[PDB]
Design a protein around this ligand. Structure first.
Ligand SMILES: CO[C@@H]1O[C@@H](C)[C@@H](O)[C@@H](O)[C@@H]1O
Ligand SMILES: CO[C@@H]1O[C@@H](C)[C@@H](O)[C@@H](O)[C@@H]1O
Ligand SMILES: CO[C@@H]1O[C@@H](C)[C@@H](O)[C@@H](O)[C@@H]1O
Ligand SMILES: CO[C@@H]1O[C@@H](C)[C@@H](O)[C@@H](O)[C@@H]1O
Ligand SMILES: CO[C@@H]1O[C@@H](C)[C@@H](O)[C@@H](O)[C@@H]1O
Ligand SMILES: CO[C@@H]1O[C@@H](C)[C@@H](O)[C@@H](O)[C@@H]1O
Lengths: 90, 90, 91
């Protein structure tokens, strides 16, 4: 069983975030121009996808974590990770 | 056993599209700033990836749906989903 | 089981698109730059693939994350061939 990843990036430095789903847990590795480091994101999930956008210089990230038929959205809007309004009927 | 997702976003509202492959079928959930809703995208596939770009304010989306070794590209260019020219090998 | 897994990225307004496919332990690349699909130079081992890219004016930079077991290897395109990146899962 191999891990499954998702990646996003922004700006010109750039900043990169790589999410890895491994044995039901999703963790995050970060690059902001110095070295790679472990990010704050840690949520359950067997599958992960991500998207992000800038509002000026501020990054907004949405991570979609799935276990079984349930996908939970996690939001970064500059202060911390919060559960989003995303729902689906899988 | 878990569903597999792909996500893309555009602009600063933003608009978000999340594709979910579940039991051989891909469906789409949409956000344009005022609640999640079910999109028009419905195509076969066990795996999904997506990318998108803007030309001015017009969004263009490409969804890559795979079953076995066959990947089919689906195109949104502002006027419905159409099958794209993408081919792989074999 | 038996289905390939893909990752895609795009840039500009032509556009250019790159689609990476992990099939039976090998990752390959298909390219579009407005004039037909062609096979790219990317060829690395892996069971899973993800990608991200960013433009610096007209210059594309791509990072492909190829995984086998718990090891993810980053591959870099900065205009001059694919090179192994500094990404690691732990310090
Ligand atoms: C500043 O915090 C770091 O960057 C944010 C954009 C998030 O990726 C977070 O999980 C990470 O720890
Ligand atoms: C403001 O709402 C938050 O951000 C939107 C862009 C969506 O991700 C939504 O599900 C989330 O709750
Ligand atoms: C207006 O239509 C909605 O947005 C488009 C960009 C597509 O995602 C389509 O499937 C969806 O129903
Ligand atoms: C113009 O051609 C259409 O759009 C391009 C950006 C590609 O996705 C191609 O496969 C598709 O048929
Ligand atoms: C010009 O070379 C083509 O485009 C580059 C941006 C890379 O995707 C490379 O693997 C591909 O063969
Ligand atoms: C300059 O460093 C290269 O590019 C950065 C944006 C990262 O992808 C890093 O792992 C890689 O080695």
């Amino acid at each position: 069983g191999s891990v499954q990843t998702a990646a996003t990036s922004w700006g010109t430095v750039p900043s990169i975030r790589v999410y890895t789903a491994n044995n039901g847990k999703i963790t995050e590795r970060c690059w902001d121009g110095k070295g790679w480091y472990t990010g704050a994101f840690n949520e359950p999930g067997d599958n992960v996808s991500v998207t992000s956008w800038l509002v000026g210089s501020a990054i907004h990230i949405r991570v979609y974590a799935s276990t079984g038929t349930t996908t939970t959205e996690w939001c970064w809007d500059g202060n911390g990770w919060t559960k989003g309004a995303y729902t689906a009927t899988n």
